[PDB]
Every structure is written in C-alpha cells, then in structure tokens.
Amino acid sequence: NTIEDAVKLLQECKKIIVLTGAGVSVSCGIPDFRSRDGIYARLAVDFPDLPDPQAMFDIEYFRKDPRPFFKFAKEIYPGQFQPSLCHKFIALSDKEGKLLRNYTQNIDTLEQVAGIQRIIQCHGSFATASCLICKYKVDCEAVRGDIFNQVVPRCPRCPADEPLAIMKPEIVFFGENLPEQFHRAMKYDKDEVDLLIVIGSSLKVRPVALIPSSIPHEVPQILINREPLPHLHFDVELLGDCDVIINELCHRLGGEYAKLCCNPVKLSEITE
Ligand SMILES: NC(=O)c1ccc[n+]([C@@H]2O[C@H](COP(=O)([O-])OP(=O)(O)OC[C@H]3O[C@@H](n4cnc5c(N)ncnc54)[C@H](O)[C@@H]3O)[C@@H](O)[C@H]2O)c1
Ligand SMILES: NC(=O)[C@H]1CCCCc2c1[nH]c1ccc(Cl)cc21
Ligand SMILES: [Zn+2]
C-alpha cells in the first residue's frame, strides 16, 4: 500500500484496466459532480427551479421538461478543453501496449484528443442523438445548431403533435441503459485484466461501480483519488491530486513516462 508498490505493479502488469471519472478533468477546467465545487453545487445556484440538481441528467425529469437540459447542454459540449496529465499517461500506456481498456464515465471526449484508442465511453457522448419516442438516430451535426441556440431539437420522423418527440444526445441519464459496447467489453475484459486502476471517481453510480468487484479478487487494484472510497477495499491507495500522483509515478517509472513530467500544481488561474 505504498507508491513504490504502485510502481512495481505498473512495471509488472501488461493488461491494465483504467477506470476514470470526473476527477481526471478537474485540472482541465471541467468540474466534477459531488465535490463542494462540483456540478450539483453550481446547478443549485444557476438552475434553482429544478426539483434537485440531479434532475438535470434524469430521464424522468427530461421527459417532463427538456428545456433546462438544452439551456445547459452547450456548457458541457465537447471541444473546448485540453487533456490532463492523467489522459496523457493513459494514452502512453496504450501506445506502450499495456492498456487493456480505459472505461470512462466522462462525456468530455478528452480521451480522443489525448489519443487513447482502447476506450469505452460508459456514459455515452454527444456524438449521436436519439428520439425519445421512435428511437430515430442522428449524428451530432443534425442537432448541433439547436444545442448552441439553447433550443429543443425535434424529431424529423414523428408528427409535430407529439410533445416527447425530442432528439436527446446519447449521454446516459439516470434510468437509461448504457451502450451495448460497455457490456460487451466487460464480458471479455474481466478474464484478461491483470491490474485495475481507479482514477478520479467516487464510484457511486451503477453499473460502472460494480466493475471493481466483477473482476477476479486476485487482480491487484490501485486507487488514485483525492479521498478514499469507504465502501471499497483497494490494495494500494494513492490519496491526493491525481495529476500530482501521476507526475510522481512518471518520474519513478522513467523512460517514456518521465517525458510526460511537468508542474501540474504551479500557480495559475482558470478563467471562465
Ligand atoms: N442525474 C445525475 O445527477 C447524473 C446523471 C447521469 C450520470 N451521473 C453520473 O455520476 C457519475 C459519477 O461521478 P464521478 O465519479 O465521475 O464524479 P464524482 O464527482 O462523483 O467523483 C469524482 C471523484 O474524484 C475526486 N477528485 C476530484 N478532483 C480530483 C483531482 N484533481 N485529483 C484526484 N481526485 C479528484 C473526488 O474527490 C471524487 O472522489 C458521472 O459519471 C455521471 O455520469 C449523474
Ligand atoms: N468530465 C465529464 O465529462 C463529466 C463532468 C462534467 C459534467 C458532464 C458529465 C460528465 N460525465 C457525465 C456523464 C453523464 C452525463 Cl449525462 C453528463 C456527464
Ligand atoms: Zn421520433
């Protein structure tokens, strides 16, 4: 349960699964969900008319009133931020052939900018949109204009008389099923994985939260996070800023990893 043990594991293991959440994008300028400076805290101020902050990405509320989501969607739309050190570390692991899979809970699509190939977007993305009623699929470009104008995009197939004929981006809301590729990948990966690393996630959301216990118990597990996850037992817990920790791991690993080293907590201001 030391940083030296994490390095030893990183040097020895060849089929690594990295599970990431909103914590890895905090340094990029994207807030997480549940921290004091998270999405929920910001939603409580900026969208006080919601029953609760969780309603913004809840399928039941979206069906009732989709206007708040399309007021907010442009704020979380991909293509405006740069990848963190963590993204680059995962990308290098992939190039080095050591990465089995990066399961990401983020929709920011920074993995694509960083160059991570072996990637699963567990909670979907803005790349496609789907009608609530008829399940008609479009690519993002068909609905991009409506999103940036804060307008509710309507289904071309369904009649104008149907109120729920709304083109919803295929990001996974509460109450929705995850993309099939997630279940497909886990079915194969669980028998191949030789190391599991969780970075920047509270693991409070099913079924992704079930991954750490769905793989063989004998597989070593590392946590890189600001806080411990009380419900889960890890073999190594590296507690603190994930970029600081990864930067320290990169120094100790050397070679190509040491080339990623930088100053992740130098004095800086993030602008709006
Ligand atoms: N209606 C809703 O509210 C709703 C709907 C759909 C999905 N969700 C989901 O909630 C899911 C789970 O959230 P999550 O785990 O990704 O985020 P989270 O906010 O729950 O947890 C982020 C974790 O990372 C840590 N962290 C933050 N910054 C860090 C840093 N710089 N270094 C190290 N650690 C850091 C935090 O302490 C926290 O433990 C999201 O993927 C989202 O899909 C919520
Ligand atoms: N960095 C991400 O992309 C995170 C954190 C920023 C808010 C949007 C968001 C994220 N993850 C999600 C998963 C599902 C939904 Cl509906 C929305 C989100
Ligand atoms: Zn339709």
- State both tokens at 239: 């507690």
Alpha-carbon 189 to chain mean position: 18
The answer to whether 20 and 106 have CB atoms below 8 angstroms apart is yes
Residue 207: is the preceding peptide bond cis (ω within 30°)? yes
30 CB within 6 A, ligand 2: yes
Tell me which of 87, 210, 225, 265 to substitute to probe ligand 1's pocket, judged by most ligand atoms within 8 Å of the beta carbon: 225
The answer to whether 120 and 103 have CB atoms below 8 angstroms apart is yes
- State both tokens at 210: 């079930």
Q: For residue 232, with 0-12 CB atoms within 10 Å meaning exposed, 13-18 middle and 19 or more buried, which class applies?
A: middle
Contacts of 170 (CB under 8 A, 6+ apart): 124, 125, 126, 127, 128, 129, 130, 137, 179
Annotation marks residue 123 as catalytic: yes
- State both tokens at 37: 């400076």
Longest dimension (CA), the chain: 63
Alpha-carbon 146 to chain mean position: 24
Q: How far is the CA of 35 from the centre of ligand 1 (A)?
A: 8
Q: How far is the CA of 31 from the centre of ligand 1 (A)?
A: 9
76 CB within 6 A, ligand 2: yes
Among 236, 189, 230, smallest CA distance to 12 is for 236
Domains of the chain as residue ranges with CATH: 1-26+84-122+180-272 (3.40.50.1220), 27-83+123-179 (3.30.1600.10)
In degrees and rounded to multiples of 5, residue 265 shows phi and psi of -120, 35
In degrees and rounded to multiples of 5, residue 138 shows phi and psi of -130, 165
Query: CA triplet 165, 167, 168: central angle to 5 degrees?
Result: 120
- State both tokens at 219: 């597989």
Contacts of 69 (CB under 8 A, 6+ apart): 56, 57, 62
The answer to whether 169 and 140 have CB atoms below 8 angstroms apart is yes
Question: Rounded to whole angstroms, how far apart are CA atoms 15 and 36?
Answer: 35
Alpha-carbon 255 to chain mean position: 28
List, chain by chain if needed, residues with CB within 6 Å of any ligand 1 atom: 21-23, 26-27, 32-35, 38, 54, 57-58, 105, 123, 173-174, 200-202, 204-205, 225-227, 241-242
242-253 and 85-95 helices cross at what angle (nearest 10)?
40
Three-state secondary structure of the chain? CCHHHHHHHHHHCCCEEEEECHHHHCCCCCCCCCCCCCHHHHHHHHCCCCCCHHHHHEHHHHHHCCHHHHHHHHHCCCCCCCCCHHHHHHHHHHHCCCEEEEEECCCCCHHHHHCCCCEEECCEEEEEEEECCCCCEEECHHHHHHHHCCCCCECCCCCCCCCCCEEEEEECCECCCCCHHHHHHHHHHCCCCCEEEEECCCCCCCCHHHHHHHCCCCCCEEEEECCCCCCCCCCEEEECCHHHHHHHHHHHHCCCHHHHCCCCCCCCCCCC
Tell me which of 37, 226, 265 to substitute to probe ligand 1's pocket, judged by most ligand atoms within 8 Å of the beta carbon: 226
Question: Rounded to whole angstroms, how far apart are CA atoms 36 and 47?
Answer: 16
Please indicate the experimental technique that yielded this structure.
X-ray
Q: Do the bridges between strand 99-104 and strand 124-131 make them parallel or antiparallel, or are there none, so unpaired?
A: unpaired
Question: Rounded to whole angstroms, how far apart are CA atoms 262 and 243?
Answer: 9
State the residue for tokens 């909670």: 123
Question: Rounded to whole angstroms, how far apart are CA atoms 45 and 22?
Answer: 20
